[PDB]
Design a protein around this ligand. Sequence first.
Ligand SMILES: Cc1nsc(N2CCO[C@H](C)[C@H]2C)n1
Length: 182
Amino acid sequence: MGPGFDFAQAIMKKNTVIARTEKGEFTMLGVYDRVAVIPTHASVGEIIYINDVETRVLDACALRDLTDTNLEITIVKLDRNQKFRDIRHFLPRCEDDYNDAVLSVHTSKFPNMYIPVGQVTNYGFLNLGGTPTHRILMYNFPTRAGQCGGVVTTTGKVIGIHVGGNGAQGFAAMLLHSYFTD
Ligand SMILES: Cc1nsc(N2CCO[C@H](C)[C@H]2C)n1
């Protein structure tokens, strides 16, 4: 509808796949080469389904900060025959607050879904399903089951992936450029 949704759509059309684990279907953000991210509560194993194709997992790492606190991001490398467009230059370098973000989801249940969530707060600490979690972004939209893995963007930046909510607010794990250096 506007330049926010334009940027969000460009990311969804080229850098997302549908990931299925034993814990369900997730939006999964491809970042570069065969490297994607997913919420850690997806419980990635040795095998994952990517757009309904059985795919070996070459590596999976549940990220924690240097206080040894959960970040709720799992970096996955996929035994896929195709690379993602490299979008690492759209990742923020520092923890920050944002205006005018969009949360975008693509699953069987919620195809081509875009939500203007508005102002995004650097919330920091959250007890997420009982797990102390750092680097949480918060937005005042009543997000629901089906939206985990959803991509949070502003014009020109990919800032987070949706990991939970409390019925009134939604919570995203930060994406930082430093997670994907090689
Ligand atoms: C905030 C909000 N507005 S409509 C909505 N949902 C969730 C996604 O699509 C469903 C069909 C619909 C019931 N959630």
